[PDB]
């Protein structure tokens, strides 16, 4: 798995590959790892698929019930609910989640929640097995307040390399753009990104 | 795997005189080959003219002393400020220790004071609460170094009257407080030389009818 969330001028973009493996067999080559917990709060899932789905489903439930009572939750609030589940059940979970969301007040925010259940607010985040291969690349090439087109290229180039070196990563590059304008889904196929 | 126990080293020594008692302990606290503190008090005044030390795993030792101090406080509330006798304190400590029989306190406990006739008393406990009244007891890391010496010097073991062939033992005597403190100081100086976990300082608590007095002596810091 290669997943990342990147803040930029207009908001935030989440990116992911589409490969799910059982050992060396690819169980699903068109997986959707970008998952919606609220209108403009999404997350990228890594680790146990069962665990991250079970968590994400519970968070979606909590934020739906939050919205009914208190109105739209902040991205920080969503990250806190993810954290609370991950931290309190750390002995029984293998979940590495990146939370990304768009407020109008706070604009684009990214929170990463690694195995322990700690929270870390960051300008951008990378995670999953394929992320190890792009720490160098992402650190050198990330800038703050990029445009939409620059951020799409940054994610596309980054995950292209993650896919290239990681056997556990592959397939299509899915992306989800979160701005004031709304929610845009993007897809990029092997024939496009491999030749970069 | 998580190991709930540790070893903070140290060594303690209780000696019962005729109308007094001492409880001494080194002030060094360690883990593995590191010194945590050169002065971390290990022997505590618990009230009612009782002194206590629980040497071994310092977290369990602190917990036990804390619980016993509280046991003294509640004994006063529940029984009209009655003085907790040393024998009653000892039995109370057995129950504290045995309550954790299947997850023990990793400590060797010694208490010192005066019995109800005014005579000096020392009591010693294993980790799960077996206890015995003794005239002499060293506990902790260097207990193996110190106890044989005390057998020889406090209880006069293997010592015979010269010229009697070997048929009249050296007769048992109570030692003066000055003599006991000399034997305590030489025990810890000796133990410091040969045991790496013993050193830094020696704090002695002396219990008489007048109260609890303290004395402190430097030990080698290597």
């Amino acid at each position: 798995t290669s997943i990342m969330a990147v803040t930029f001028k207009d908001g935030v973009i989440l990116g992911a590959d589409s490969r799910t493996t059982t050992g060396a067999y690819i169980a699903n080559r068109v997986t959707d790892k970008l998952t919606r917990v609220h209108d403009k709060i999404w997350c990228c899932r890594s680790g146990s698929a069962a665990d991250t789905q079970a968590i994400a489903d519970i968070v979606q439930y909590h934020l739906e019930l939050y919205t009914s009572q208190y109105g739209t939750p902040s991205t920080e609030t969503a990250a806190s609910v993810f954290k609370e589940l991950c931290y309190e059940n750390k002995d029984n979970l293998t979940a590495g989640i990146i939370v990304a969301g768009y407020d109008d007040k706070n604009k684009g925010e990214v929170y990463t929640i690694p195995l322990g259940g700690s929270v870390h607010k960051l300008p951008y985040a990378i995670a999953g097995s394929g992320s190890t291969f792009i720490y160098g690349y992402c650190d050198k090439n990330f800038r703050e307040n990029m445009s939409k087109e620059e951020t799409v290229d940054f994610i596309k180039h980054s995950l292209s390399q993650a896919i290239k070196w990681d056997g556990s990563s592959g397939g299509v590059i899915r992306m989800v753009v979160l701005t004031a304008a709304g929610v845009e889904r993007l897809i990029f196929y092997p024939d496009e990104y491999e030749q970069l | 795997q998580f190991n709930p126990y540790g070893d903070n080293g140290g060594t303690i020594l209780g000696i019962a005189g005729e109308d007094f008692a001492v409880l001494a302990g080194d002030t060094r606290n360690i883990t593995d080959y590191s010194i945590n503190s050169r002065y971390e008090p290990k022997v505590f005044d618990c009230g009612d003219n009782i002194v206590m030390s629980a040497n071994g795993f310092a977290a369990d030792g602190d917990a036990l002393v804390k619980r016993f101090k509280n046991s003294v406080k509640w004994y006063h509330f529940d029984h009209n400020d009655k003085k907790l006798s040393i024998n009653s304190a000892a039995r109370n400590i057995q129950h504290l220790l045995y309550g954790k029989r299947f997850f023990p306190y990793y400590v060797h406990t010694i208490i010192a004071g005066l019995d109800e006739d005014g005579k000096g008393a020392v009591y010693s406990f294993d980790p799960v609460g077996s206890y015995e009244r003794e005239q002499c007891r060293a506990g902790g890391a260097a207990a193996s170094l110190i106890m044989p010496f005390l057998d020889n010097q406090v209880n006069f073991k293997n010592q015979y009257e010269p010229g009697t062939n070997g048929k009249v033992k050296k007769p048992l005597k109570y030692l003066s407080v000055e003599e006991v403190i000399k034997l305590v100081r030489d025990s810890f100086t000796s133990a410091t030389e040969r045991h790496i976990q013993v050193g830094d300082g020696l704090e002695i608590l002396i219990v008489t009818k007048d109260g609890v007095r303290k004395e402190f002596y430097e030990l080698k810091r290597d």
Binding site: - | Q94, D126, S130, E132
Partner: protein, 212 residues
């Protein structure tokens, strides 16, 4: 640890050693392995020092409550069974006890019950318990008869513990003797092995294996 108790014409002899160890470290030579439950009841201790001392002291409290409630002295059978039923509840948890409950009552006569931490409860005339039991059995079985003098029986119990104190590394210190009669138990002293051994060697002409 060597403890023993045997029945004879003149009642019950109970003898124990006085040593406690943590492995090969001799922790004490002055330990009490006999608990005086009441004037007609005795308990012997082998195995874990704490386990025996705690639960046999507790047994004494349960025996006291029995005589308050029933206005009558607890039977040796009933006292031994309170302890055996208790340890049985804890079975598998790792208690370590080998014990004998010895006493006289009018209805039973002199009685000895062996009780241990794996739940065994046995009535019998002779028992030896502890790491030195085999050594004590050797001396005891050979010179045992039903009709010893109280003086001879006290000596045999003393001598059997001495035998074990010598051979068993984990037994020693001193010998504590008891005699149980119709009228109750009677203490027959603490005998240091370091003095007793040489005394017995000279007077008896035994222990010829030793340089004396």
């Amino acid at each position: 640890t060597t403890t023993l108790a045997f029945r004879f014409q003149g009642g019950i002899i109970v003898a124990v050693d006085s040593r406690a160890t943590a492995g090969n470290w001799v922790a004490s030579q002055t330990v009490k392995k006999v608990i005086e439950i009441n004037p007609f009841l005795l308990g012997t201790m082998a195995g874990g020092a704490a386990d025996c001392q705690f639960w046999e002291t507790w047994l004494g409290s349960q025996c006291r409550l029995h005589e308050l409630r029933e206005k009558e002295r607890i039977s040796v059978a009933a006292a031994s069974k309170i302890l055996s039923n208790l340890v049985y509840q804890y079975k598998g948890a790792g208690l370590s006890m080998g014990t004998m409950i010895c006493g006289y009552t009018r209805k039973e006569g002199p009685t000895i019950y062996y009780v241990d931490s794996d739940g065994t409860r046995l009535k019998g005339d002779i028992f030896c318990v502890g790491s030195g039991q085999t050594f004590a059995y050797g001396v005891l079985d050979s010179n045992y008869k039903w009709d010893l003098s109280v003086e001879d029986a006290l000596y045999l119990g003393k001598r059997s513990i001495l035998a074990a104190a010598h051979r068993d590394a984990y037994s020693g210190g001193s010998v504590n003797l008891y005699h149980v009669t119709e009228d109750g138990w009677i203490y027959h002293g603490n005998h240091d092995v370091g003095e007793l051994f040489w005394k017995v060697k000279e007077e008896e002409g035994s222990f010829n294996n030793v340089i004396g």
